[PDB]
Amino acid sequence: GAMGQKAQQKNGYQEIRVEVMGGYTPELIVLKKSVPARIVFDRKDPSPCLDQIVFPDFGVHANLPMGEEYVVEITPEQAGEFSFACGMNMMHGKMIVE
Numbered sequence: 795g796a797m798g799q800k801a802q803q804k805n806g807y808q809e810i811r812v813e814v815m816g817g818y819t820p821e822l823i824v825l826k827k828s829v830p831a832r833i834v835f836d837r838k839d840p841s842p843c844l845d846q847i848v849f850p851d852f853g854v855h856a857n858l859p860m861g862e863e864y865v866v867e868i869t870p871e872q873a874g875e876f877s878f879a880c881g882m883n884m885m886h887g888k889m890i891v892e
C-alpha cells in the first residue's frame with residue numbers, strides 16, 4: 795500500500811478533505827480505484843497563488859472561492875500516481891490510486 799491520507803469510503807463514493815493553506819494539507823492522498831471520489835477543498839488562504847486547483851490527468855482546472863468549500867469530483871479507473879497543483883503549478887499535491 796501507499797503512504798498518505800486515505801479517502802473515507804461511504805455511500806457509493808469516497809471522500810477526502812484537503813485544506814488549502816500555504817499549499818494543500820494533506821498533500822498526499824490515497825484513493826481506491828474505480829470508486830467515485832469527492833476531493834473537498836476548503837480554502838483558507840487568500841493568496842492569488844491558490845486561486846485555482848488543477849488535476850491535469852483528469853481534465854480539471856477550477857476556481858477555488860476563498861473561505862468556501864469546492865469539490866473536485868473524479869472517478870479514477872486507473873491505478874497509479876497523479877499530480878495536482880494550483881493554477882500556477884507552484885503548489886503541489888500527489889494522489890495515489892490503488
Ligand SMILES: [Cl-]
Nearest residue numbers: 842843882884
Ligand atoms: Cl504566486
Ligand SMILES: [Cu+]
Nearest residue numbers: 843880882884
Ligand atoms: Cu499557486
Ligand SMILES: [Cu+]
Nearest residue numbers: 842843882884
Ligand atoms: Cu503562484
